[PDB]
Amino acid sequence: PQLHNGLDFSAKVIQGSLDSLPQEVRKFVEGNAQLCQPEYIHICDGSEEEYGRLLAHMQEEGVIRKLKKYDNCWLALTDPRDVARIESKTVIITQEQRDTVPIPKSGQSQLGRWMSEEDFEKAFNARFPGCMKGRTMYVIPFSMGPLGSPLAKIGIELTDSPYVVASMRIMTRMGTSVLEALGDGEFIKCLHSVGCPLPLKKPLVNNWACNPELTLIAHLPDRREIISFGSGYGGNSLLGKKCFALRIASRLAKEEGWLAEHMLILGITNPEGKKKYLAAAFPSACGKTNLAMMNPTLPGWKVECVGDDIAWMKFDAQGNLRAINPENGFFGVAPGTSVKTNPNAIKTIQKNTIFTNVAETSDGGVYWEGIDEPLAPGVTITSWKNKEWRPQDEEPCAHPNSRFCTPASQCPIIDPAWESPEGVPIEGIIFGGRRPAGVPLVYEALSWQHGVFVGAAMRSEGGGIMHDPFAMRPFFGYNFGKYLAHWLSMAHRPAAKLPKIFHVNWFRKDKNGKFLWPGFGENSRVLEWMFGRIEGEDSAKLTPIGYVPKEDALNLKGLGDVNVEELFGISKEFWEKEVEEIDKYLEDQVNADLPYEIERELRALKQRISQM
Ligand SMILES: Nc1nc2c(ncn2[C@@H]2O[C@H](COP(=O)(O)OP(=O)(O)OP(=O)(O)O)[C@@H](O)[C@H]2O)c(=O)[nH]1
Ligand SMILES: O=C([O-])C(=O)[O-]
Ligand SMILES: [Mn+2]
Ligand SMILES: [Mn+2]
Ligand code: NA
Structure with a gap:
């Protein structure tokens, strides 16, 4: 031929x-x-x-170095011009x-x-x-x-x-x-x-x-x-x-x-043995991997990880929103990973893992900002730039977007259905990112259409506060207005079991710059509230932005120093400017492609705020 x-x-x-x-x-x-x-x-x-x-x-x-402290782990250091998307x-x-x-x-x-x-x-x-x-x-x-x-x-x-x-x-x-x-x-x-x-x-x-x-x-x-x-x-x-x-x-x-989303998928079991799966979309740098692999501080609760980054979701014949993790591993940010912030990640990454752009200790281990593990006196650090490094130096020892690449199978809390071909049934979808002011720890959307608006309106601090709708701003495969119409259309699928939608903020700060909520495994207290709300518990107070926990509805035992008034507060003035800003953004960036139901949700929020 x-x-x-x-x-x-x-x-x-x-x-x-x-x-x-x-x-x-x-x-x-x-x-x-x-x-x-x-x-x-x-x-x-x-x-x-x-x-x-x-x-x-x-x-x-x-091209790579063996990390001699661990079982089959490896280190790549890149050209600094090639460190991120x-x-x-x-x-x-x-x-x-x-x-x-x-x-x-x-x-x-x-x-x-x-x-x-x-x-x-x-x-x-x-x-x-x-x-x-x-x-x-x-x-x-x-x-x-x-x-x-x-x-x-x-x-x-x-x-x-x-x-x-x-x-x-x-x-x-x-x-x-x-x-x-x-x-x-x-x-x-x-x-x-x-x-x-x-x-x-x-x-x-x-x-x-x-x-x-x-x-x-x-x-x-x-x-x-x-x-x-x-x-x-x-x-x-x-x-x-x-x-x-x-x-x-x-x-x-x-x-x-169906749906392809920048979402972790986790399974959470309460002390009664009831289990629900949740998906959550937060932007990069806002803590999906920590939540996905959470070690809950509340006794008797358990979290198991299905995936930490991408979810593919489709309604089955019974109306369940079924989710799979299309990935086979975790490509997680290394800096800030510690026993305190992600103990299950620390366990997963000690074998069969490739690290990129982290520091190397003199005994062949890994190091990064936030690892929160003291080294023995005498142990020295090589930065990700391949230079000797000490903690007083101007620059970090690891690149801020350095990564581990680790098999999902290894994770001690990988869910047993993480490879089930039919997927896991999602009962709640959580949006959130970094908001230092104005937005409380957790709220619940009033309806599917309000929840799609809450995804659409997401903003997060990264070089100032920017829109990152659905945590997908770098990732839309097609026109965002059409993406919103596609999400809205899920409401019209007969006998769809539409997940409850929440919004979280782990990052609210007081006037001094201090985080109001300790976060990490304490976020289990927020997930308990969501679980009860999916169960129909009368644990919610109505506000203009959606439902929030009633007074005493969250378990705050062991957190008596939390400033509940500030963390949970909703200001008319903040929310008037928020709706003002969302309107400018949607008109500029979406305009003729904005679905009517999004415009209506924006008007409805503005009206509720007006009655404060
Ligand atoms: N204050 C606070 N910070 C958190 C919490 N959870 C995660 N973080 C912070 O979030 C950052 C880690 O999140 P990343 O691993 O970059 O986020 P991600 O969503 O997994 O990002 P990609 O993997 O890039 O999609 C660190 O700055 C953590 O300190 C929390 O509950 N409270
Ligand atoms: O997960 C990541 O790699 C990201 O969101 O950039
Ligand atoms: Mn991640
Ligand atoms: Mn990601
Ligand atoms: Na290299």
Whole structure:
């Protein structure tokens, strides 16, 4: 079927066989091998043997270091230009701009970043041809969701980064069993390169290949493709997680009747043995992983983790909102993780875990701001910049967005249904983020439509207070106004069991800057209130913003120093300015795409505030 050797890359395969691949997977591999010109093709099998050899290869090449204090843990230190997601280099391609993002009246959208097909083809051709020369193209067959679950979706990621292969093995289900479950079905095409073909055109920093100037993380939902160039950093290179399981999946979800969300999923059991599952959307840096893995301070309660970051949710035939965690691991922020703030994370990450951009102690352990573990006198610290470091120094020892990447199976409180293919039944959905003033510890939405407004109106402090609706602002796969209409439409599904919606604020401060609520495992007292409210307990007082706990409804035993008047207070003046601000934002940023029911909820809140 060829006049020379066709596009047959068999001679370059150093693991597996191109002949073993489904036809359309082979076409995707060979077309991109032609384009990108890798030296080798490695078809990943997901085996332990393969993982061992991969880690050895990286260690021998100086790309990662073994952390000798622990069982099979590893440390990567990146070029400091490649440490986080780059929103401004993250784009979605569609025929029409407005299908991706509403058109902002001000000319600056906060809700996504569109690129035309024409501009993208130019950007692609300026980056990918020959980009893998001298490197290995790894072929990662992966499932998002339990292997074979009706809610799961398969991708193929091609990458030139063994760091991406190792981290994908932890964060997804990957290898031959996925190829077998795939057969001749559809898959999301995921193409990644660090963008540094050999011979190197620019010097490597910290032995970490990347191309910051040409970094581009693109999503082509109408082609079912994700194409990412120039960054090796997690959210940009592990294409299953944010690219696929939020941006592409949210659009698929809109078309197919389900939801793909930046939500943890936890199961909570009370002292009577009754168990409920809850989902919660908080922005990055606002504590999802702590809540998901909570060690409750209240006696007789238990929390178990289904996932800490992404939820795929669909109503079943009985009307339950069923949720799965499409991930296979936790890619969690390391700084601030301690026995105090997340003891179950500390237990999970002591074996089989890859750390990126944390500090290293002289006895081969890990360190970061907030770890709250004293070192023995004499033990020294190497920062994430590979310099000696001491606590007086101007800069932190770990990057503030440094991460662990750890298997979910390992977590001592992983829920027994964390891989159940039908998902877990969600009875409450929680929104929240960082509000230093005005917003009380917890309230309950008055209706589904009020609850969708509460998600839509979310704001959180990060370089000042900014809108982050549904905790999805970096992640919408399509126009946010349409996303709101999709959520609202869930109310019209016959016999839907609509979860109760809450909003929390762990971050309210007094006039001195001091947190009013101790948080962490004490948040169990808030979850107890939610649980009772889902049970229909008469534990709520009506206010203009929704229901709050009655006086004495929260268990505050052991917290007598809490300033309940300040923590629970609602000011007419604060809320008048809040509605003022929400109205300006929705008009500027959503305008013609704003659903009527959102506008009505905004008017209803304003009216309730007016009667204060
Ligand atoms: N005061 C207070 N801070 C909290 C609480 N829970 C978490 N935090 C803070 O939240 C931060 C940790 O949250 P992250 O792990 O970055 O948040 P995340 O939502 O998991 O973020 P992504 O993994 O990026 O999606 C740290 O600053 C913690 O101190 C709480 O109950 N009270
Ligand atoms: O950036 C994030 O939200 C993350 O990696 O989870
Ligand atoms: Mn997290
Ligand atoms: Mn996240
Ligand atoms: Na490095």
